[PDB]
Amino acid sequence: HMSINIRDPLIVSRVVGDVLDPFNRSITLKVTYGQREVTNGLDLRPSQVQNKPRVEIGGEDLRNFYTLVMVDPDVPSPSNPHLREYLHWLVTDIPATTGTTFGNEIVSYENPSPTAGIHRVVFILFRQLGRQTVYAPGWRQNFNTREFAEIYNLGLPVAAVFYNSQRE
């Protein structure tokens, strides 16, 4: 078992738990809609997330590549999340220090539009085992980030951020 900080927003929100195993944040992930950075549980309205966000990343070595997963585990609602997880966006082969515009968008961005309950919308970054090794799933619904990472040898996350959103 890895140590956790029980006051970490990823723990309190159950993002770590429902979606991810415990991990150590090791790589910068900056996700911005408009002028708002997606930090630990801030709220964004659906009308503010119609466009893919700007996404910048850090890195370990310049030669590393990263994959970004964006999921809503709370679909159609957190009380009955029968589509858990819904894959909103998947970008692979992101070079260290760059961002998603330098990667390969393998699942196009779909804007989250919750209609029931308050949803967590989660961005997760993984270090790859090689460029061009990660492939899109056949379906957006019932995605499983943990299993995806296992299939592609992505390891534990290197970063994750999230926002909350509900119907306007």
Per-residue H/E/C for the chain? CCCCCCCCHHHHCCHHHHCECCCCCCCCEEEEECCEECCCCEECCHHHCCCCCEEEECCCCCCCEEEEEEEECCCCCCCCCCCCCEEEEEEEEEECCCEHHHCEEEECCCCCCCCCCCEEEEEEEEECCCCCCCCCCCCCCCCCHHHHHHHCCCCCCCEEEEEEECCC
Resolution of the PDB structure in angstroms:
1.0
State the residue range of the domain holding 95: 1-168
Interrupted after residues, the chain (C–N over 2.5 Å): none
Q: Show the tokens assigned to 3.
A: 């140590």
Contacts of 77 (CB under 8 A, 6+ apart): 114, 116, 117, 119
Q: Show the tokens assigned to 13.
A: 């929100």
Technique behind this structure?
X-ray
Q: Which amino acid is at 11?
A: I
* Total number of domains constituting the chain: 1
Do β-strands 42-43 and 159-165 pair in parallel, antiparallel, or remain unpaired?
A: parallel
Q: What is the CATH number of the domain that holds 35?
A: 3.90.280.10
Phi and psi based region of residue 79 (left: phi greater than 0; alpha: psi -120 to 50; beta: remaining): alpha
Do β-strands 65-72 and 54-57 pair in parallel, antiparallel, or remain unpaired?
A: unpaired
